[PDB]
Design a binder for this molecule. Structure first.
Ligand SMILES: [Mg+2]
Ligand SMILES: [Mg+2]
Ligand SMILES: [Mg+2]
Ligand SMILES: [Mg+2]
Ligand SMILES: [Mg+2]
Ligand SMILES: [Mg+2]
Ligand SMILES: [Mg+2]
Ligand SMILES: [Mg+2]
Ligand SMILES: [Mg+2]
Ligand SMILES: [Mg+2]
Ligand SMILES: [Mg+2]
Ligand SMILES: [Mg+2]
Ligand SMILES: [Mg+2]
Ligand SMILES: [Mg+2]
Ligand SMILES: [Mg+2]
Ligand SMILES: [Mg+2]
Ligand SMILES: [Mg+2]
Ligand SMILES: [Mg+2]
Ligand SMILES: [Mg+2]
Ligand SMILES: [Mg+2]
Ligand SMILES: [Mg+2]
Ligand SMILES: [Mg+2]
Ligand SMILES: [Mg+2]
Ligand SMILES: [Mg+2]
Ligand SMILES: [Mg+2]
Ligand SMILES: [Mg+2]
Ligand SMILES: [Mg+2]
Ligand SMILES: [Mg+2]
Ligand SMILES: [Mg+2]
Ligand SMILES: [Mg+2]
Ligand SMILES: [Mg+2]
Ligand SMILES: [Mg+2]
Ligand SMILES: [Mg+2]
Ligand SMILES: [Mg+2]
Ligand SMILES: [Mg+2]
Ligand SMILES: [Mg+2]
Ligand SMILES: [Mg+2]
Ligand SMILES: [Mg+2]
Ligand SMILES: [Mg+2]
Ligand SMILES: [Mg+2]
Ligand SMILES: [Mg+2]
Ligand SMILES: [Mg+2]
Ligand SMILES: [Mg+2]
Ligand SMILES: [Mg+2]
Ligand SMILES: [Mg+2]
Ligand SMILES: [Mg+2]
Ligand SMILES: [Mg+2]
Ligand SMILES: [Mg+2]
Ligand SMILES: [Mg+2]
Ligand SMILES: [Mg+2]
Ligand SMILES: [Mg+2]
Ligand SMILES: [Mg+2]
Ligand SMILES: [Mg+2]
Ligand SMILES: [Mg+2]
Ligand SMILES: [Mg+2]
Ligand SMILES: [Mg+2]
Ligand SMILES: [Mg+2]
Ligand SMILES: [Mg+2]
Ligand SMILES: [Mg+2]
Ligand SMILES: [Mg+2]
Ligand SMILES: [Mg+2]
Ligand SMILES: [Mg+2]
Ligand SMILES: [Mg+2]
Ligand SMILES: [Mg+2]
Ligand SMILES: [Mg+2]
Ligand SMILES: [Mg+2]
Ligand SMILES: [Mg+2]
Ligand SMILES: [Mg+2]
Ligand SMILES: [Mg+2]
Ligand SMILES: [Mg+2]
Ligand SMILES: [Mg+2]
Ligand SMILES: [Mg+2]
Ligand SMILES: [Mg+2]
Ligand SMILES: [Mg+2]
Ligand SMILES: [Mg+2]
Ligand SMILES: [Mg+2]
Ligand SMILES: [Mg+2]
Ligand SMILES: [Mg+2]
Ligand SMILES: [Mg+2]
Ligand SMILES: [Mg+2]
Ligand SMILES: [Mg+2]
Ligand SMILES: [Mg+2]
Ligand SMILES: [Mg+2]
Ligand SMILES: [Mg+2]
Ligand SMILES: [Mg+2]
Ligand SMILES: [Mg+2]
Ligand SMILES: [Mg+2]
Ligand SMILES: [Mg+2]
Ligand SMILES: [Mg+2]
Ligand SMILES: [Mg+2]
Ligand SMILES: [Mg+2]
Ligand SMILES: [Mg+2]
Ligand SMILES: [Mg+2]
Ligand SMILES: [Mg+2]
Ligand SMILES: [Mg+2]
Ligand SMILES: [Mg+2]
Ligand SMILES: [Mg+2]
Ligand SMILES: [Mg+2]
Ligand SMILES: [Mg+2]
Ligand SMILES: [Mg+2]
Ligand SMILES: [Mg+2]
Ligand SMILES: [Mg+2]
Ligand SMILES: [Mg+2]
Ligand SMILES: [Mg+2]
Ligand SMILES: [Mg+2]
Length: 68
RNA sequence: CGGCUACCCACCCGACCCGUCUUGAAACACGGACCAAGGAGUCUAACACGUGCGCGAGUCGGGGGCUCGCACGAAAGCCGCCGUGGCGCAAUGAAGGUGAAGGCCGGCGCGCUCGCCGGCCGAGGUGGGAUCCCGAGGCCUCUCCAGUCCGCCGAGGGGCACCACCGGCCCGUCUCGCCCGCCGCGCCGGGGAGGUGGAGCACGAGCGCACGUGUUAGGACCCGAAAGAUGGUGAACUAUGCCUGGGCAGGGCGAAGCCAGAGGAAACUCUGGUGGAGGUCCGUAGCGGUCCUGACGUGCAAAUCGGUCGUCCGACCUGGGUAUAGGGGCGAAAGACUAAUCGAACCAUCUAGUAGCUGGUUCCCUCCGAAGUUUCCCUCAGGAUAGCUGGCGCUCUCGCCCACGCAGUUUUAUCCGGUAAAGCGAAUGAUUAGAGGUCUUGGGGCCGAAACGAUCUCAACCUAUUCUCAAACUUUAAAUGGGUAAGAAGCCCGGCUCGCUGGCGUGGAGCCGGGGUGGAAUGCGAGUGCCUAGUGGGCCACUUUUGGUAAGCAGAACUGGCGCUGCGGGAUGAACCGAACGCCGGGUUAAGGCGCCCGAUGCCGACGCUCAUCAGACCCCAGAAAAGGUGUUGGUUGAUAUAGACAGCAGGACGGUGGCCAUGGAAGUCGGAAUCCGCUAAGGAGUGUGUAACAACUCACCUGCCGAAUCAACUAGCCCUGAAAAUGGAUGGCGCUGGAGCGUCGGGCCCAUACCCGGCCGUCGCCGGCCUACGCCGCGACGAGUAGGAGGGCCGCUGCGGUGAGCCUUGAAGCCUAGGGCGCGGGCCCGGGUGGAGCCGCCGCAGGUGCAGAUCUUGGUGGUAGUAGCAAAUAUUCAAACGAGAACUUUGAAGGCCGAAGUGGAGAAGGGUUCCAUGUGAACAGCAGUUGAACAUGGGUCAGUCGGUCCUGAGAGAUGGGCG
RNA sequence: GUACCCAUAUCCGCAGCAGGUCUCCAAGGUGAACAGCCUCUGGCAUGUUGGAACAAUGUAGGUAAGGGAAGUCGGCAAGC
RNA sequence: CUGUUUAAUUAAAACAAAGCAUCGCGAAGGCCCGCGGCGGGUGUUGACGCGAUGUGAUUUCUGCCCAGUGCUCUGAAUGUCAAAGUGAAGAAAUUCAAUGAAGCGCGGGUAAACGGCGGGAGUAACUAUGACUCUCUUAAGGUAGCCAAAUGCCUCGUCAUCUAAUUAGUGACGCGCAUGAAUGGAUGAACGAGAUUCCCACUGUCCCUACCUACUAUCCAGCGAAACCACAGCCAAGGGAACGGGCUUGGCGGAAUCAGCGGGGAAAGAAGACCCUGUUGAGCUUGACUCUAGUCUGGCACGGUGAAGAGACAUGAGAGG
RNA sequence: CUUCUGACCUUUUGGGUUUUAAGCAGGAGGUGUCAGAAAAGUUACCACAGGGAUAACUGGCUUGUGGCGGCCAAGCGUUCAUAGCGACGUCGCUUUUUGAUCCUUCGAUGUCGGCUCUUCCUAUCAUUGUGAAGCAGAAUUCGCCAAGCGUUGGAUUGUUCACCCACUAAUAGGGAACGUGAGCUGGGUUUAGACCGUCGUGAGACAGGUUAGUUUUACCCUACUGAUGAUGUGUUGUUGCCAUGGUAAUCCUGCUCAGUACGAGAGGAACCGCAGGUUCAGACAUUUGGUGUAUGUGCUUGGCUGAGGAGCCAAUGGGGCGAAGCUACCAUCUGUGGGAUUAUGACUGAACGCCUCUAAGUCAGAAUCCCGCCCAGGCGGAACGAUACGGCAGCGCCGCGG
RNA sequence: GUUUCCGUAGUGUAGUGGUUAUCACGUUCGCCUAACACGCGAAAGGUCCCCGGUUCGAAACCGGGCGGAAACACCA
C-alpha cells in the first residue's frame, strides 16, 4: 500500500491561477518593531509639536507670505 | 399537389453496453432476463453567514389575562401600573473590584522633564477618498447695454463610507517618583509619566419574523454485519444418570468340577469319556458404517441406496416415565450433541446498534469550474488546516498637451549563487612512468686487519616533469534563474519640537508652509470583504536526474497533456502530431496523405541508389547488435607504367655454404641470434609444399611474346550473411521493382468542430427610449468540460387559499394511436378510438414531489421449452360387463411375486372421520378414470368381569420452617 | 375410551417421498439353521406412465485365446 | 485385547479400559453447587471410602539433578506489612512514634510435580578408530536401552538381503540437527473394516479390447419444471485494463434443425474458507492492563461469669553512670 | 495533576481572627510512537465489512540468473591457431528454469503430478539428399536444405527432476493460461481428528516427518463428429465434372553382392535384386479364437404341476457344447508415381587478357513442396428420359392482336 | 542472506570499573630413586587476529577487514 510521498508538481500553475500578489500598498508605514528609545524620542517630540508650534510657525507663515 | 414527422425498408459513412471503484472500462472488473407500482439528503434544536420586511437604542408577547356561546374560531383582536424576562446599549480582571473627553485662550507658583483659577469649543490629526460648493475664462446672424436663455472648465475649498498611520481614554499586571482628602490621620484611599496584554471606547445598530447555504447532535441520504445486554421457550432429535418393560436363529473352540482304566512306594502322572465356561470364534435379526472415494448428486432423501462390511450374551440394542437448560447442561473426549443451527441454541426487546467500509441516490436548460499538494493527527482506504473553486456583494475608474494602478513579459542599471565546463606542472584525496641531484638508513660487490678512508647499485628523500580522475575536491567559472529601482507616496528650500544623541543651532526622526508631473517598452480597467462544496489513491511525455542489469519498475525538478476532452492524422490508441467543441452554408489550411479500398499526383515531375531464395516502406510505434562481403555506388591516402606495368603462357632462380647455436635430424624449409660479396638478366644465408634428413616442385627477383592503363589499404550509402519458437498472419491488407522502395526536392490536389465571411440561439459588457419598465430595442466579443457551486424554467406530480358568470353525461379523469403541431429540452396542445364523473388555467403556499440500476422490495411474464425428467424392489395377458369414452374400474381364466424374520392377521404412540353406503367426476391423484384416503349427502364406536380410574417406583410437589 | 391406518398410500420428514418409528402369531420341502431358494393359508399388480426400435455414452450382471499385477501412489475393483 | 467416538467428508496409531502410581480428607473435614439460610451433591457414605490427576495388559527396568517455576512444614528468634487500637504536639482538622495478623523474604523437603541431561585438546611400534590424561564448566551433564524408527537437515547416510533393475521393505553400524526412561524406555503370545514390503494361487488392472442381457438414454401418447440470461454468439493478427465476441485490418458469411461430445463462453453454484486493511469482533492462553466470585487472615458488635500470670502507661521512695 | 518560590496579593460564600484549601505569575516531576492512549500472544474451529490500493497461479515489460549462438585469437590439437576446440575480453537471442515489478483478476479464472488425446516449433536423436575431418574400411564428430514420419517396455519416488535393467535407427529438446479436474485419478501439497522431534510457562507454531480425509451441474449458444435439410435450373429422376478442404505411409532385419573394395592386419561395406518383419491406415470373417438368451440342444441341483411323460420357477438357476451376426497384430488381404526445385555438385562464360557454378543463361537434384491415387462434393455448371384425361379438363411450340 | 558472540605463550582459559603479561597442562635444568612415574626448587616461550581513531597513556572504548561459532529464513 505504498503511496506517492511528496511532490511540487502542479503547484506553480495553482499559484498563478490567482495572480501572486505583492502587498503593493503601504503608505505611512507601520511603526511597531522600532527601538523603544527612539519611540521615547518620537512620542514626546510629537506631543510637544502638538503643544508648542503655534506662534513661531504663524509668524514664519506671515513672513513668507509678505516676502513671497 | 405538398408534407416534416415516435410507420416500414434500402443505400453511403460513423458507430463496442449502460451505471460506478479507478490514473485507466467495451472489457476475460462487478450489478443488470423483461415489465408495472414503491424507493433514497426529510424534520426538530442550536450556531454562523447572506438576503427580504417591520420597528429602531431599543426590540420581541412565544407566558398568562380580556371579548357573547359560534362552522372557518386550536384562527384572529387587545393588554402596557402585565416588559417579569431574552438580546443589545461597557468592557477588563482568576478575584477583591475598577470602568472609556479631550482640546484652545488669559493670569498665577522659578510656563520648572510642574499644578491651580476664569472663559470658550468639542468625540482628535495626517494621506487617499464617490459626491457637493465658490469660480478666472471663453461660446451663441451687424453695434454701447443688460437679464434666465447655448454652455462646459483651469484652479481652489468643505470633505460620506472605508482603508493606512499617528495620537488620546478605560481594565489587569511592570518600572520611576511626587502630591492631595479625612464620619478619623491607619501595612487609609485617590491622582501623574512611560512599554506592554483585552474579544474595549474613540456618536452606538440592535431586536423580532421569514427564506437560502454550511456545520453539529438527534435513526440523520437509503440498505448492510462478526458482536453486547435484558427477559422468557425447548432433553419429541441427540448426550448422560435413574425407574419400569421388551429382544438377541444356528454351528466352532471345550475351563472348573466329576467318572472309569493304567503306571508309581509316595508325590502324583498318562489315556478315554462327561461337563458347558467365556467382556470367545463363523454367522442371522438388531446396532453402527470400512471400501468401491460405486449409484444418486436441481436426487428417494437439506446425508439416501447396492454390494463388500465390524460386532452379535453382551462395556449389547430398544419403548415409556423422570432428572440435568445456555456461558448453562451433557460428553468411553470429536469443543462432538443440546429439535436440519453449537469453538456458546431458539424467540422477542434495547435496535432503524455503529461502521474511516461495498452498492445506490429520481426533471431540463444556461454560466463558471478543480485536486490527488504544504503541515498536523496510533496518522497511511480517514479527518483537520492551507492551496485550487463557486456564489453574494462593496469601493472606485473610462466614455471630451494629459490620469491612478497591475503584469508567469522584455529593456537599462545594481547585487546573489558554485551547477554544466575546466583544472589538479594549484590546496585536499587518489594515481602512472621516466629523468637529475646526492642528505639518511637498510641489503649486496670492490681496494684490505677494520675504518662516513674511498668506490658501484638498490631503498627512502628532494627538484623539474609526465598519465588519469573526484556527487560528499577546487584557483577560475558559463547558459538558465532569483531580488531590487525605473517618480507627484518623488526632488529641493525655509522654519519649529525632541525627555533620542551630543564640542557645536552636532547628527537623526517628527511636524508645518511653498515650487514646478511630459519621467523605458508592450498589454490590460483595478482594489477589497463574507460564506462554502469538492479535493486530500494519480498517471504519461521532451529535457535534468536518484536505486536497479533493465522494465509498461520505484522515487524527484520545470513545463505541457490525460484525468476534467470532443475533432483531423498515427489502420486500431490515455499520454503522440496538429488543433481544443453552441447549430449550419461557402472558401482556405494545419498534422497527414494523393496505386485500390479511402477523399487527393491520371504532373508526358527531376536527380541518383537498390535485385534482397527472410528486400523495403515514416517520432513515440510494436524488433536487433558486435563482425564480415572481389554484390554495386561514390570518397581519401598511396604505389606502378613506353627508361613497354598489371594479368596470361615459357625459361632462369647460383657460387662462397651441407653458413653459424643445435647430433634424432636442418644440406635455403622444427627451432634462437643474424645478414655480406661475386656472377650479374637474378637469386632474398631464403615465401610456401614435401623428405626423419639427403632430393624434386613453387615463390621473392629477372628475362622471352602480347599490349596500355593497373594495383594496394582504408572510408560510408543501398543490399546480403550474422538473424532460432512454438494455432495461420500481417509496411493495415491487396499488392508493388522505368516504384506503389530509398534520400533530396518543385508545382498542384484532399479535409477538422482549426482560420475568414455570413444566417440563427444564449451569456456577458457598454448603452438607448417617460413602451408588461420584471417589457421593448442597438452594438461587440465570446460558448467544451467529470467532482462541485449558482441563475432561470409559461417543465412536471399531490394538496391549500384567492381567482376564470372556467370546462363539461351533446361525455371529465385514465389509456391507445402509420394523425397535425409547438418548444433546444424538461414536456405540452389539438384530432381519432374505449371509458363513464369528476377535472384544469393564473397568482401566491406547503410537500411523503420526477427513477435505469442498489445480488433494489412486491406482483406478473419470456428464452431455456414442449427440453430435462415421469427407470430402486423379475410381469403381465385374453374375454365379458356397467358405461358416450378402458394399457389402468369389476368379474371369469392363465402366468407370476411377497413365502410365515411376509407385500399376511391385529396392537402402543401419532392422525381425527380418513371407517361404511350412495351420487358427481370442472378441482385434486404429477397421463387416466366408470376409480380413490377427492368432492356432496347420510350413517357408524353400546362393558361390574378390556383399560384409565386404586397403588407406589425414579421423581415432582404445598403447608410448618427459612430465604428473598 | 372403544370406528379405522398402525403403513414402500390414513404417523413424522412441505408430498401417495428407496428415509425413520415400539410389538404378538408364525406352516411344507431341501437344509445344522427364524440362513438362501421354491410352494400352501393369506395378500398384490411390479410400486406417481404406456406403445415401437435395441444407436453412442451410462447404470447394474456375466464372459473371453496366451501372459498373470508387466496398469496404477497403492492387487482399487473383480476373481480364486 | 472386547468396547466407544467427530449424526451430514475421518472409526484411527484417537478416547476409554483393568493394571501401576501420586496427592487431599477422621465429618466444626476433602472436592464441588447455590443470590440467599450452618441450604445441598458425594452421603441410606467413613481410608479395602470418597474426591483429583499421570501412565496404560504381562515380563524387565523407574538412571542423575530442588539451580528455576510450583506445592508443603516450622518458628512474633527475625526485615516488610493494611484497617482498628495506644501515646505525644496543637484550639482542632491533621501530623508523628512505637506496638506488627495473613502473605513475601529467611531454612528444609518433594521431580511416578512442571521440567532439564555440555562443548574443546593431546594421546596405542603401518595408518585411522581410539582404553587413558590436563583445563574451563553447570544443579545435573543422556545411565540402562533403541534407532536413519510415525523421530535423521545433510540423505536416495554406509554395508548386506530382496529384484534383470528399487528414493520402497528388512537386518546391522551409531558424537543421534532434535531418541530415551510412568513426558514412560525395551520386548511381546492373541486381536486389529489401522499404516507399509515381499511370495504362491487367482483373474480383463493391463497387454488389447470385443460381445450379450435388464433399465435409461432415441421416437411417439398424455403430462411437463429448474439453474442461468445487458445484447447475442465464426476465427487469425494488432492495440487496449498487457489473452476480444462486439473496435481496426484481413480471412469471409444463407433459413429451421436432431443425436452426441465437453475446447470455449476468463460457464453456473457462494459479498475468496488462502494473503492484507479495519483504531470490526469472537473462542481461547499467560509472569499484558484493570477488576471480581471464592478462599486465608486482623479489627468492631452478637459475646457473658471466676481465678492465676505477663507486657505497656501514670504516682512517690531508694541504689545507679 | 503534584511540588517549590513571590507579594507583609485575592477568595475561603451572614460578619471577624488563626490553620487549611483555591487562584495569580515562573522553575521542576513526561508522553523517544518525540505536537503527547495507559496495553501480551494464538486461532489449521475462526467470523464480518472490504481490497486486486495488497502477496501465493498464469498472462504482460526486463533478462540479472539458466540455456543457446557469434566476434579477434594466447594456446590444446606429436609439427601446425581456426578438422574439432578455445582462455583473457566482447556482442546478441529465448521465455523450456529462477529472479524483479504489481499492470488485469479478492461479489473466486478450481492449485501439483500422472492417464488419455490433438496441434505446432526447431536450438535434428534417427531416417532422405549433401559438404568437411587428425574421414583407408567400419564406427564417430562438425555443419546445410529439412519437422514428413518415429522418438519404448519397466524397478524405485506423489513426483517435476534423477538413477538403474533390457530392447531399438533413436529412446532429441520444447510450446499450446508452467495444454488438458462441468475428462478422470486424489498420491502428497492445502481445512477440521491424531502421532513423533524442536520452540514456547501456556494456548499454539514448525518449505521437519507419517496416517484416514464429500472432487457439484450441461437440457443453453458457439466449436467439432454424425444426420435431416434449404436456395437457383418449371416439377422430378437417371448418368456425370471438380472449384475447394484434408491426406499416408514410415522404418528395420536376413541372403547374394562379398568375408570382395579398403586395410599389413584385426576387421569390414556400398548400388541393383530377392524373402520378409515393426508401427500406422483401410477393410473382412473362408479358417482359428472370443461372445452368446435363436433362451438351439443335452446333463444336473432345490421346489411345484398326483407319479412317468411333458414341463415351469429360483431378478438370463448352474455349467458342457453351439448356428447367424459383431469382433481380434489373436485370424486374413492391401497400401501404389509425376513435376518444379532447396542444400549440394556442375556446364558455358564475362566482370577482371587468366580464373570462376552467376552477372545474364543451361544440367543433375531429395522423407521438403505441389499434383496424381484416396475421401465429402459449391447459393457451381452439364447430357438425357417422363412431363398431368375423364366425363368437362389441365399443360407445351409457332405467330397473334387488347 | 539477516542479527549477535568469540579470536590472548604449543593447548584450554582468566583479566581493567583504560596504567598485569594471569592460572594449569606442554618443553627444558637440578634434587630425590639404582633407574622410570610422582613430588619439590626454577627457567624459557605473547604481534592479547590484522589495520586506524579517542586519551598523557589501549589488547582493553570505538570504526573497517580476516577466520570461526549461535538464532531465523515463516503464510500461501
Ligand atoms: Mg498521496
Ligand atoms: Mg474505495
Ligand atoms: Mg487498479
Ligand atoms: Mg464503464
Ligand atoms: Mg470475476
Ligand atoms: Mg461486466
Ligand atoms: Mg449478472
Ligand atoms: Mg415510480
Ligand atoms: Mg427588565
Ligand atoms: Mg442569556
Ligand atoms: Mg443492522
Ligand atoms: Mg464489549
Ligand atoms: Mg428423550
Ligand atoms: Mg455418551
Ligand atoms: Mg465375543
Ligand atoms: Mg452405507
Ligand atoms: Mg462416492
Ligand atoms: Mg455381516
Ligand atoms: Mg461377513
Ligand atoms: Mg464375531
Ligand atoms: Mg452472558
Ligand atoms: Mg444439530
Ligand atoms: Mg467461536
Ligand atoms: Mg451470548
Ligand atoms: Mg440507516
Ligand atoms: Mg497521510
Ligand atoms: Mg469568484
Ligand atoms: Mg564535471
Ligand atoms: Mg457539498
Ligand atoms: Mg481517497
Ligand atoms: Mg514513476
Ligand atoms: Mg488533451
Ligand atoms: Mg477520478
Ligand atoms: Mg483542464
Ligand atoms: Mg483518429
Ligand atoms: Mg499504428
Ligand atoms: Mg481516388
Ligand atoms: Mg506493446
Ligand atoms: Mg507482407
Ligand atoms: Mg459550458
Ligand atoms: Mg420520497
Ligand atoms: Mg402528502
Ligand atoms: Mg423500474
Ligand atoms: Mg442512475
Ligand atoms: Mg435484483
Ligand atoms: Mg434429450
Ligand atoms: Mg355399452
Ligand atoms: Mg409360482
Ligand atoms: Mg419372532
Ligand atoms: Mg409384518
Ligand atoms: Mg374409505
Ligand atoms: Mg360412481
Ligand atoms: Mg392426473
Ligand atoms: Mg372430505
Ligand atoms: Mg418446592
Ligand atoms: Mg378396533
Ligand atoms: Mg414411505
Ligand atoms: Mg422433507
Ligand atoms: Mg420347515
Ligand atoms: Mg432336515
Ligand atoms: Mg407408492
Ligand atoms: Mg484371459
Ligand atoms: Mg484362458
Ligand atoms: Mg501363474
Ligand atoms: Mg509405486
Ligand atoms: Mg478387494
Ligand atoms: Mg473365473
Ligand atoms: Mg467415516
Ligand atoms: Mg504396564
Ligand atoms: Mg524419572
Ligand atoms: Mg490508627
Ligand atoms: Mg529450598
Ligand atoms: Mg598413532
Ligand atoms: Mg548413549
Ligand atoms: Mg514395490
Ligand atoms: Mg536429545
Ligand atoms: Mg456460422
Ligand atoms: Mg480472435
Ligand atoms: Mg491477442
Ligand atoms: Mg500471448
Ligand atoms: Mg466476452
Ligand atoms: Mg459491429
Ligand atoms: Mg472505434
Ligand atoms: Mg443439439
Ligand atoms: Mg469480499
Ligand atoms: Mg489507522
Ligand atoms: Mg547469462
Ligand atoms: Mg497492481
Ligand atoms: Mg467459476
Ligand atoms: Mg473456467
Ligand atoms: Mg510433423
Ligand atoms: Mg495449467
Ligand atoms: Mg489424497
Ligand atoms: Mg496423505
Ligand atoms: Mg489436519
Ligand atoms: Mg480411511
Ligand atoms: Mg455431458
Ligand atoms: Mg588390400
Ligand atoms: Mg486397424
Ligand atoms: Mg467358438
Ligand atoms: Mg429336479
Ligand atoms: Mg419327469
Ligand atoms: Mg443359463
Ligand atoms: Mg463356449
Ligand atoms: Mg546453384
Amino acid at each position: 500500500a505504498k503511496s506517492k510521498n511528496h511532490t511540487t508538481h502542479n503547484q506553480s500553475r495553482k499559484w498563478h491561477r490567482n495572480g501572486i500578489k505583492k502587498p503593493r500598498s503601504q503608505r505611512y508605514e507601520s511603526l511597531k518593531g522600532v527601538d523603544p528609545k527612539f519611540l521615547r524620542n518620537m512620542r514626546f517630540a510629537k506631543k510637544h509639536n502638538k503643544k508648542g508650534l503655534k506662534k513661531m510657525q504663524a509668524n514664519n507663515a506671515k513672513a513668507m507670505s509678505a516676502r513671497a
